[PDB]
Design a binder for this molecule. Structure first.
Ligand SMILES: Oc1c(Br)cccc1-c1[nH]c(Br)c(Br)c1Br
Ligand SMILES: Oc1c(Br)cccc1-c1[nH]c(Br)c(Br)c1Br
Ligand SMILES: [Cl-]
Ligand SMILES: [Cl-]
Ligand SMILES: [K+]
Ligand SMILES: [K+]
Ligand SMILES: [K+]
Ligand SMILES: [K+]
Ligand SMILES: [K+]
Ligand SMILES: [K+]
Ligand SMILES: [K+]
Ligand SMILES: [K+]
Ligand SMILES: [K+]
Ligand SMILES: [K+]
Ligand SMILES: [K+]
Ligand SMILES: [K+]
Lengths: 208, 208
């Protein structure tokens, strides 16, 4: 209870409405109702701060703010600097995923608490193959969603490793791929889509 | 010119209409206009034969029919038994992909002709990871579409290998993954989606 800090990445496609609520608020509220969650650090341009501070008084979590950075890992680092000195888990979430279920968030929190690092994923429905640099097929795969859940010590150690050795963070060379510490994949729901198109937004409403 | 036989897998989500033409006819017509294409072998339940034989007289290819099998590889084998004794390439296509562009089909035909086996693919937009049997992340990926283009000798040799050794054909352990012969991945278009949902069908119309 009150052990988890959420870093909510909200820095424009995550403020466009879905039944008249900006997409970013769906997951915001889902996290605010979970007794495990102590605080939510929203990482957004100071413009849209009010979109969230409006509800500060009704929600049952502390709210905090951080400024976005250049790339997604900068924004996480920025959020991390504002979490509570004693939180046991950091829960990083892309606000463009509105439909994450409370039950799936409980699952990945539990797994992150057990393993140290966990991510919600689903089996990749497409036929996916590795291709080499000559465009030839190189003779089980999962799609990663968010939350991505990590103990704060591990995250901080991960940022230090990258800075200390000027490592390259690609989308698929994560910070955690550099650590030897294991990352668990918690099985989520195919309904936890990311919103980036109007046809995504039709799906969103079809699902709600 | 007239060197390619198409095996069109059409064996119900590929007959539902898209601007009032059953989905299966879009690619059927795309192939029928290409001078390279000699014949199209439609693999469908004898029910819907008429959906295609109606146009037999206007299209500029020979039309042939084969009966579906248990699994997708059975239906390809069934189609293969009806191709022309002298075709140089077999072009296998899922009729649930209506929007394949003529230019992308020309590309994968050329690559299959050069390499012996080619498939239209696109870089996988999701973050995809390998996961082991303990659900831990195992520390370039492409989504395969169709056509899948293969010289007929190679396909036949591939079917013989599987039967000869009772190998297991999963969706992702293809017949071609058993061969030592290389498979080229021709870069396609993200618009070459597969139709399986109404939201897919909204995308289809949004794209046309
Ligand atoms: O990708 C992760 C997985 Br998979 C599991 C736990 C944490 C992460 C993660 N996500 C981001 Br954005 C950062 Br920076 C980090 Br570390
Ligand atoms: O997957 C393929 C690639 Br990738 C490239 C060429 C041919 C194939 C293929 N597709 C199917 Br269905 C069969 Br049976 C075969 Br062999
Ligand atoms: Cl990411
Ligand atoms: Cl397949
Ligand atoms: K709470
Ligand atoms: K979602
Ligand atoms: K959201
Ligand atoms: K979910
Ligand atoms: K445990
Ligand atoms: K999308
Ligand atoms: K033709
Ligand atoms: K298509
Ligand atoms: K079609
Ligand atoms: K295409
Ligand atoms: K060549
Ligand atoms: K789909």
């Amino acid at each position: 209870e009150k052990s988890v800090s959420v870093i909510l990445l909200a820095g424009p496609k995550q403020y466009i409405p879905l039944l008249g609520q900006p997409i970013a608020l769906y997951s915001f509220f889902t996290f605010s109702r979970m007794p495990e969650v102590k605080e939510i650090v929203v990482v957004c341009d100071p413009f849209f701060r009010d979109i969230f501070e409006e509800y500060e008084e009704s929600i049952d979590v502390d709210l905090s703010f951080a400024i976005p950075g250049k790339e997604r890992q900068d924004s996480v680092y920025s959020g991390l600097q504002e979490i509570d000195v004693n939180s046991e888990l950091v829960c990083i979430h892309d606000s463009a995923r509105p439909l994450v279920n409370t039950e799936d968030v409980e699952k990945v929190l539990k797994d992150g608490s057990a393993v140290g690092a966990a991510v919600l994923g689903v089996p990749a429905k497409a036929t996916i193959k590795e291709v080499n640099s000559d465009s030839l097929v190189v003779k089980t795969l999962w799609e990663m969603q968010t939350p991505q859940v990590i103990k704060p010590e591990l995250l901080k150690k991960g940022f230090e490793l990258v800075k200390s050795e000027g490592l390259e963070v690609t989308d698929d060379v994560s910070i955690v791929e550099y650590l030897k510490h294991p990352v668990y994949v918690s099985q989520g729901s195919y309904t936890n889509i990311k919103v980036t198109t109007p046809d995504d937004l039709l799906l969103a409403e079809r699902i709600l």
